[PDB]
Design a protein around this ligand. Structure first.
Ligand code: PEZ
Ligand code: PEZ
Ligand code: PEZ
Ligand code: PEZ
Lengths: 258, 255, 258, 255
């Protein structure tokens, strides 16, 4: 099946930033024709740890910016919602509506996304066990969602640390397509992440077997207004994608049937 | 004064709230040194299953809670799940409760703070004790002056929560601390036998209040049936923690 | 029942150190007649993280020193063993043979301690679940142990951190007397512990209900050759004991029947 | 060359070792680029129950292992549990294995190092990856020159282990790293369905070898019956990880 690569800057710092990253993602989409690229960027970081951290420029501005990326590059779009009322307006541009990890159990939010007719990707909560995502999928199907994804992004392991239990991939695959979040899984919650572990863990993900990967990427991560310690330098995206496609190919014959 | 937040998990009916409200009113008159706050949720917005009980809506809930306050003169507290709910809930709620999964949702915290009411945030199962400092800062920036942080367990492997009592003294540095005796022993996706033992630990360590879900017939409760405390056992547990607190308070560490 | 207080310097730095601490423990034993005091000190720290850390002066020297404490103060003695051959020689002086947390599953060590006729106290491994101590007790009873204790000393919680799940107290009480280790439960494994949490957690232990407490104490912890960050200053011992006896008394009527 | 440590969990009989040894010898001839090491324990010294199978003793075990080496020319490895066992086990064991629960026992490590043999330490379920540096230092101080560290899972709540693959690159800084594919999925006090998936992850991340318990009829094994790999499936898994390693190795990070 066509492998999914969800990538883009963590936050919509500006429409300019989006177009710059979008241009590169479009270039890669022309090279890796076996991959379905989906451009991602949040119009609002509604759960920052600090009240002083960057959040965004609003839903209106964000949707407009994402619409520009789609119009200029013909790329599919995904962004996350935080409250039920945002589902409808976001659905006007987003091909995939993303549900934040902390909100994976909020029934009304899931239902709001599901009734839009768009695909829905739920980030698995850091508090959730793999088998408990079955009910998350059930809620979505109940709400009308026909294309559902579950994203592995790490599990609470002691304080300010996340561990990736790769057994979650084959478990969740039982009821939905599975995406591996390569950048959030190495973040150290409330720590201030370890970028040195992004590549090795993404290699593990495709060796185990998943339906796609999620990666935050920015031209200059150190200057990012969010996830500055974990966003992947844009220039490194192509090489990482080539590597995972190669590993996926050689491991694919061994992927177990669900 | 020591706070005791109690009531049925969900507003299954105003009748249920009245029955429980009558008992909490009685204890309220018996333990004058304790500040009682009646609690019940108008909506269980985060149930695991789509087929589980959620409630009768916000309007019916605020109505029933209004009835408890008017008929018994008890303070009220209930939780909100989206920003728009803050204002209407504040009409009756003396303390607005923020769900554990939603303790990092900035707009929900700000919305609650804006009402002028007290705010009690359930510490997320994913949050470290020291990371609650930023939660308090959001509420203060939002205008809140009476702020509570509630210990309700931390993710410990799958489908299990552990109470790290070191959290009580840590969180006390920036807010009043409440110990949730019923959700702390629940097994996500619990054991009532551990409720009393751990609540005794909480007061021995030192906290500003305790939170307990109580129901006349927990077995029939439409929510948290395995952990809600039988109404008839509430008085005994309250007297027990007051006695333990009386002796232990001598040793509570300064701030 | 008579509450147990197991206390003493972590390691047998010298026979002098033992006598100094022993004198204070003897004084307290005369005051707190409702408490059964047991003097503790390790003749060898056989599991230090670093090869460069202090271990001890040998079994022979240690046993001799402990024998001096018992002879001079009439105090019961306890120390830990690391290999089966040490059980017999240690049993000559130790009233209670202690089994290290990492070795709580080593069948031969438990059996070696059990056949001596002495009481045996097993530190619950940081990897062990409360209900899995039932088999530990079974092994001991099988080996002839008639007086058995299980000691709560924390559980692995992420990296370099331990958490005390107080539910373990009533669970383990089902099959053995339970001791709460107040100083090791706050240590941060391979961290370099937080002494500020020793007192609050010990208060929790007696409120929940246990059969005794274990505390490492040293005249000048900062100068200790082991557990310098967690050993309780000797001058603070009396006050801590008074406090837990007071809390135990008021909470005792509520202790659940196993 | 890549290391593959395999064999039945316990020496249930020299006959069993011979049957498994014959297959490992065959694969040894098929995969010349791989260094095979035959493994089996002469004693399961840490069983949960006093009534569980331990083995036939050290003498019978070393005897059977000697038979495997002599009859097949395969390297040998078995674990020790007390210091005195190091010398006699070293008579046949090319690699002395240190149990996970015993990875911090200084005298056991030194005893193993003194024999002059290679030493493979199972990382304790309680140990952080970076804390294995001190384990290596003990062995070096003891005279060991060939040192391995084996990833076998970390305590994750109760009766569960999680494999934090970040450990592979971290431990590689100071020793050769082996991934234990069978114990990493066992549930303390497991699921065979996760063995292959995680071993694929291990080679994709990068390691120096893999450890696998294999038995002709795992269902009848007297130890780790729920996780031992059926002998007939070993060849396929080895070929699979060699292919994945061949492609993935291009991306292994430098030291
Ligand atoms: C909050 C934002 C976010 O992800 P989580 O919900 O998994 O943390 C994101 O991908 O932008
Ligand atoms: C969801 C409801 C709830 O608490 P948590 O947010 O701590 O789970 C409650 O107290 O009703
Ligand atoms: C190793 C020494 C030791 O305890 P643990 O086994 O619980 O760590 C002790 O109390 O001396
Ligand atoms: C006990 C035996 C054992 O391994 P651990 O020490 O990792 O559990 C083994 O590989 O035989």
């Amino acid at each position: 099946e066509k492998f999914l690569v969800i990538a883009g800057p963590c936050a919509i710092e500006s429409e300019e930033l989006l177009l710059k990253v979008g241009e590169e993602i479009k270039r890669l989409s022309e090279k890796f024709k076996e991959v379905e690229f989906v451009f991602k960027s949040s119009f609002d970081k509604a759960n920052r740890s600090s009240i002083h951290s960057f959040r965004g420029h609003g839903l209106e501005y964000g949707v407009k910016a994402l619409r520009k990326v789609k119009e200029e590059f013909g790329l599919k779009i995904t962004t996350d919602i935080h409250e039920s009322w945002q589902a409808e307006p976001v659905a006007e541009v987003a091909d995939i509506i993303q549900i934040p990890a902390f909100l994976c159990r909020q029934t009304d939010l899931l239902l709001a996304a599901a009734k839009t007719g768009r695909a829905v990707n739920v980030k698995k909560g850091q508090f959730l066990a793999p088998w408990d995502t079955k009910n998350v999928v059930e809620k979505l199907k109940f709400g009308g969602a026909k294309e559902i994804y579950l994203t592995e992004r790490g599990t609470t392991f002691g304080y300010n640390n996340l561990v990736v239990d790769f057994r979650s991939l084959p478990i969740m695959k039982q009821w939905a397509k599975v995406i591996y979040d390569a950048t959030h899984s190495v973040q150290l919650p409330g720590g201030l992440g370890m970028r040195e572990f992004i590549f090795p863990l993404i290699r593990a993900a495709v060796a185990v077997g998943c339906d796609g990967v999620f990666m935050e990427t920015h031209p200059e991560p150190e200057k990012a207004l969010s996830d500055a310690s974990t966003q992947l330098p844009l220039s490194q995206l192509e090489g990482i994608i080539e590597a995972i496609l190669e590993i996926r190919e050689v491991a694919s014959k061994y992927y177990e049937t669900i």
